[PDB]
Amino acid sequence: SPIHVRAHPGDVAERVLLPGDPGRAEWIAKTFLQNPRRYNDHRGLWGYTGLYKGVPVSVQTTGMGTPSAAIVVEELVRLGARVLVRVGTAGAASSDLAPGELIVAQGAVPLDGTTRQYLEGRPYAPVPDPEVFRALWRRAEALGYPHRVGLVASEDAFYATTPEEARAWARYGVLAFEMEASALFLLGRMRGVRTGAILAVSNRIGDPELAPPEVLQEGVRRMVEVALEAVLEV
Amino acid sequence: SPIHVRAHPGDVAERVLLPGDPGRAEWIAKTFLQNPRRYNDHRGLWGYTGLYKGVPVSVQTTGMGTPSAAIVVEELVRLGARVLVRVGTAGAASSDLAPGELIVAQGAVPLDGTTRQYLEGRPYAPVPDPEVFRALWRRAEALGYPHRVGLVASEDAFYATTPEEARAWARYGVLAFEMEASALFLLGRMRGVRTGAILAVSNRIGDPELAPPEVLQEGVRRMVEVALEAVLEV
Amino acid sequence: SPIHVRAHPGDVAERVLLPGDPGRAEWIAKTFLQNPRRYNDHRGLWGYTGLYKGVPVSVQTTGMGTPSAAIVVEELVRLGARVLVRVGTAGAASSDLAPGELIVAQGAVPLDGTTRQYLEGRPYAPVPDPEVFRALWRRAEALGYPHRVGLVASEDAFYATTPEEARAWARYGVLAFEMEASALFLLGRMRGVRTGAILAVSNRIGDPELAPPEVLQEGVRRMVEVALEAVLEV
Amino acid sequence: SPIHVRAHPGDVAERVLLPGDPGRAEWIAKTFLQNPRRYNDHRGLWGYTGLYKGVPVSVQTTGMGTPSAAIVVEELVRLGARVLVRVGTAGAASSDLAPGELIVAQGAVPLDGTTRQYLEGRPYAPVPDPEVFRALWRRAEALGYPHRVGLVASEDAFYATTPEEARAWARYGVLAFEMEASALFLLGRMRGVRTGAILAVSNRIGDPELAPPEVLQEGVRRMVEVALEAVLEV
Amino acid sequence: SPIHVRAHPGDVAERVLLPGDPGRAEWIAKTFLQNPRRYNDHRGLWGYTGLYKGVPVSVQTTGMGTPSAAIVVEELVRLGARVLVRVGTAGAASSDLAPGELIVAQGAVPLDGTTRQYLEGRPYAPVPDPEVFRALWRRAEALGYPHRVGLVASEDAFYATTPEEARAWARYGVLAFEMEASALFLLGRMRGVRTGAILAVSNRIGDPELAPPEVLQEGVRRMVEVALEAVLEV
Amino acid sequence: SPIHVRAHPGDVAERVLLPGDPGRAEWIAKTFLQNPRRYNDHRGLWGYTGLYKGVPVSVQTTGMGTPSAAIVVEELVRLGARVLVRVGTAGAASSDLAPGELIVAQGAVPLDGTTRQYLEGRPYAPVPDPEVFRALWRRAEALGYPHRVGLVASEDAFYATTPEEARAWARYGVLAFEMEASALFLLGRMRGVRTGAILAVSNRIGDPELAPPEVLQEGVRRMVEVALEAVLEV
Numbered sequence A, B, C, D, E, F: 001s002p003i004h005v006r007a008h009p010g011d012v013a014e015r016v017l018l019p020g021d022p023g024r025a026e027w028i029a030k031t032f033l034q035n036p037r038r039y040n041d042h043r044g045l046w047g048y049t050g051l052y053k054g055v056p057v058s059v060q061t062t063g064m065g066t067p068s069a070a071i072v073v074e075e076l077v078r079l080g081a082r083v084l085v086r087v088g089t090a091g092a093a094s095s096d097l098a099p100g101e102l103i104v105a106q107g108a109v110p111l112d113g114t115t116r117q118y119l120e121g122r123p124y125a126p127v128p129d130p131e132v133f134r135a136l137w138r139r140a141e142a143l144g145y146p147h148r149v150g151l152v153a154s155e156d157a158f159y160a161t162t163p164e165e166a167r168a169w170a171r172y173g174v175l176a177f178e179m180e181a182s183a184l185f186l187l188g189r190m191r192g193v194r195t196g197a198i199l200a201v202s203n204r205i206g207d208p209e210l211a212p213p214e215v216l217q218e219g220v221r222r223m224v225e226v227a228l229e230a231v232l233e234v
């Protein structure tokens, strides 16, 4: 059994969804999974397994920052995870992106040290599994939920980045900022597993808060659905 | 008129293919375009323009390496380019990819100094325009030629990379090595244009001479077809 | 109201202890604090407050990795924290440190990208607040608890570091490897608060499992005693 | 036979001039070489060999950029090149250097990524072969053609540097910018062959094109003469 | 015998004060040492050995900059040195450190290349030996002289750092700029010896000369005393 | 009055030789200069100004390391120094160079932190002033003294380079290792003065000492002689 996500074989499922917030996790469990079960809760890393249209699905809590995610991801794989999709939030770096809108992450600028440490300092292009990426983009499109398809950025210092610094990054193709996608993608390739990431804009960089409960909450919901449907596909 | 690609106000089309070998360029313009016209030969950077299935299409030689390629791209853009797709060759990072196989660049691991100079040393994830990428994958499917979808890596010292080094990069998801994608993908986002890349494996890193030219020429043809069909998609 | 540690001024007491996993927080709260009040549980960042020997002391969850620890320390500062000491666990890099022993953080070798992004590439030497450091030190002696005073390393990739890399680092002085010390020390100076760090060696790098539960809890128990007594002396 | 310079052993002399643009290669071959013969035109890398004052000399196109130039040089040495002199143009980094003036490159600040790949990121000082360097200088004086002797800078991204950043480098001794020298100088030392570089200023950094036509040409003619005289001396 | 400090093993004592200027060494040796004798004067690295209250103590010159300092510290270790304390001057980075004030070095920010070459580009936290650090501190209060305890930055280019950049560092907690501590501390750990540093502020970066001849000299004296006492304990 | 080199205006000549050893300075002053007169002794940085064949010339100790030399060069130039040439020692990188041999420094690989601080981490090619570089070479020949022409490597940590690494560097053209060239060369350009460096090989990297004192001394005498003839040239 792992050191963090203390689970034994049989708990985790093939397809797994990775949420940073232990809350959204639970809310996913109770809201989309039949007879959801919680295999782990150690370190607040709440994780559940239930069924979605029969198919076994999982929902494991990564935490905040590629370091924590990496630890959980690495362990979910050792436990049996084959298809993991991130279900999180982000901070818009532009203005064209309004809160609640969804983003299918094409790739992730590695502004984190975790991927760096794994790459021993080498450059890289973290990208999801083309099948998963394709799947998310397709279930989104099929469901009719307006979205965006592009780049994000996985930083480490939440309060370091400034609106201005973000404006510049946007000129490079970055749409918003998150804190786990880059590592998910690296390990994804590194360990021979398919990974993906879908994000809900919960605010624009420069402002001290999230979005009017309902606006973002729908997003968080649309996102979670597209995710689930995509995995069952891959 | 641009410094290198000395084309005029009305010579370049919105949809352009970017081969590195001026030789391949000319061949495409003759084998696929109607009423083909060479608008430039300065510096051996042959660029042709004509009609493909009633749609205006251009073929511009980029040369080898991102330094050469960024100059050409930067100039195609101020010349009208809007959809630029790279039709090139690459060396497989490992043995699971044979010569003549197609690779649809999902992203490019930036091991070049050109993107490094443009990004002032900042990390980044050179990825194509999702739309164009999506197309390339579909026409590759439609036409039904043996291919792959994933990461390639753009290097600078062609003769630097060792077979041992390549295989390590393979353990990071890189399927093959080439010398342009990265910058194109970068400039694409920087100058708001949709770009893409499709490569035809011409050898496995470590070989003295490329494999049977008949098998590589056919690989090339398939690539150019997909690419041309895909540019009409966007 | 912080964006992550959804609290309010008055909830957090000047002197604060910072454990990595909430489970250990609760323990400390319920165990050493009278009338403990968990003012936050958002994102699993369990944060309590209560009386210790007649002085309001707090217990805040940082999460794993300096990225998560950064946000917590950054908000704890916005709420009114002045004396923040981390009470954690680490993996010994040397073959001389015994499981269950204590380590007073004289400094933290910055091997994480959080501190890095906050410094913008600049070289630094992350150290605690002079006094706190001196506090943790003088107590651990008056309390006859065998401990060590020296350097620890702060990393992002928990599973990257192999025993061999660890011994190498031990040659420079790294006693063990943890994951929150550096950014805590950094922010200490950056924000103006007094920080510190004491740790419990839970294992020897490269090993899949800790040692006898009994020993590891008495090491942590001690750690908090040596800690709580200090935050009051400064 | 090499991959890019499809030529046989005896198709290349011991002494070689390396112009970046194939049109000048051809011009040189015709304007200066006796009984010159084109031994390659693959990928537009026009290469001619003939006699200059009874001695054989080759004029080989390198292409734009160190990656391309590196490939060319590597194969040339494989082909028997022993003395390679780059004969190209450059953008002045200061208002004192006027179009047409010549520059005997004493060294090249390595702003390119090719050298870096070969240097695995180590610092370095790309300098020519002392004997070659001195002959160029000497002949320039012998021919009474005015010139400058100093550093040039080799970059990757032509359109990245601005009039500001360039003259900034001037304050470090950078006379002008180009895109091949550094890789040539490094490889000269790595493979053990004598290399040198001379340049015809084609414009001042900040201008949309170049200067008055005849001026530059007379500069190029002098440049090639100096280079030709020199290679026969070493 | 060592290449630079040409002394005999019996010459260097266990405890050693490390002044940067040979003028201060000679002074120390003659002001505080009983029956002092110079054991070396090669390369002007004046080194003296004497008795300070029954105990033998050496005062070795290091020169300016970590390269000179590292050469010295390395050879002193090889000649039996166990405890080395740097008694140098420094430049205030902020306005709260009027010259004459004392600084007990807790850590030294590595802005030098000596520690960079040793560490092989790896990050680090140069710090003194705990017990030695503790001693200096205690003796300063004991003897009762106004002092400050914190960080100092070790740089290579004295005339580089500008008045602004200093305040920029002040914001990360740098108390002053000197030129040796970092390497002394790194070697301290590598070669297993006890090192420390107590500085005497001489100016405020951006200063052309110095301050009141009177003040600076008194501060220096106290310094040498806090240092001489200290070493006696450890 | 400069801070370190406390010389009055007019004490230092236009031409100056730069030995790193104050013992060598005095010897040079009293060996080759007519009417030698020391103008500074502060910090063992011995400085002399006498006459060489009627021409005023100064010899100024730089100390060991680029941070030191950098300081003295900055100060001499501010004093009026115009032609500064280093006359020092260095250890051969391979069996290619024997003790007592002269090296005319064509360029200096910057492995030091000083040039890196000035340069702000940017790549660079430290070269001597072209005319001075030439006069040295020119005088080397006329005098009949056996010498090599090429690269050296200016490093910071004397005791850090392994014999192995020296060989790795030889592969890239580095002839020997020393500790001042690079900075002297960067300041040369930065401050508009003419510089150069001639070296006497005193050993091979690896050996714990030096060669036969009578062998090296003649190398030193030839070195100085060449430099003196040279400085009068420009």
Ligand SMILES: Nc1nc2c(ncn2[C@@H]2O[C@H](CO)[C@@H](O)[C@H]2O)c(=O)[nH]1
Pocket (backbone or CB within 6 Å): A020, A063, A064, A065, A088, A089, A090, A091, A092, A155, A157, A158, A177, A178, A179, A180, A202, A205, C004
């Ligand atoms: N860095 C960053 N992460 C954000 C932002 N908004 C939401 N997040 C995500 O949610 C967490 C922070 O609450 C991180 O794990 C991110 O992935 C933002 O503006 N910046």
Ligand SMILES: Nc1nc2c(ncn2[C@@H]2O[C@H](CO)[C@@H](O)[C@H]2O)c(=O)[nH]1
Pocket (backbone or CB within 6 Å): B020, B063, B064, B065, B088, B089, B090, B091, B092, B155, B158, B177, B178, B179, B180, B202, B203, B205
């Ligand atoms: N770097 C690299 N490029 C290759 C290889 N094989 C084909 N190419 C491509 O074709 C050119 C080199 O022949 C470059 O422009 C590449 O994009 C290979 O093994 N390595």
Ligand SMILES: Nc1nc2c(ncn2[C@@H]2O[C@H](CO)[C@@H](O)[C@H]2O)c(=O)[nH]1
Pocket (backbone or CB within 6 Å): A003, C020, C063, C064, C065, C088, C089, C090, C091, C092, C155, C157, C158, C177, C178, C179, C180, C202, C203, C204, C205, C206
């Ligand atoms: N990186 C690292 N963290 C450790 C180790 N042992 C305990 N930890 C700590 O506990 C968490 C990982 O379980 C991190 O938050 C660390 O601070 C170890 O061997 N390595």
Ligand SMILES: Nc1nc2c(ncn2[C@@H]2O[C@H](CO)[C@@H](O)[C@H]2O)c(=O)[nH]1
Pocket (backbone or CB within 6 Å): D020, D063, D064, D065, D088, D089, D090, D091, D092, D155, D157, D158, D177, D178, D179, D180, D202, D203, D205
């Ligand atoms: N980077 C750069 N290369 C230049 C410039 N002017 C001429 N060149 C040279 O000519 C090509 C660009 O036109 C490159 O191959 C360079 O070697 C200039 O201003 N900048």
Ligand SMILES: Nc1nc2c(ncn2[C@@H]2O[C@H](CO)[C@@H](O)[C@H]2O)c(=O)[nH]1
Pocket (backbone or CB within 6 Å): E020, E063, E064, E065, E088, E089, E090, E091, E092, E155, E157, E158, E177, E178, E179, E180, E202, E203, E204, E205
């Ligand atoms: N870098 C630096 N060193 C200083 C300063 N003031 C005194 N020093 C010290 O004294 C020498 C420079 O005079 C160096 O050896 C330093 O350790 C200052 O402002 N900056």
Ligand SMILES: Nc1nc2c(ncn2[C@@H]2O[C@H](CO)[C@@H](O)[C@H]2O)c(=O)[nH]1
Pocket (backbone or CB within 6 Å): E003, F020, F063, F064, F065, F088, F089, F090, F091, F092, F155, F157, F158, F177, F178, F179, F180, F202, F203, F204, F205
């Ligand atoms: N780094 C280094 N410097 C050397 C060597 N031999 C002589 N030196 C020079 O002389 C001093 C070291 O003795 C430094 O100031 C160098 O410039 C050597 O082998 N390595």
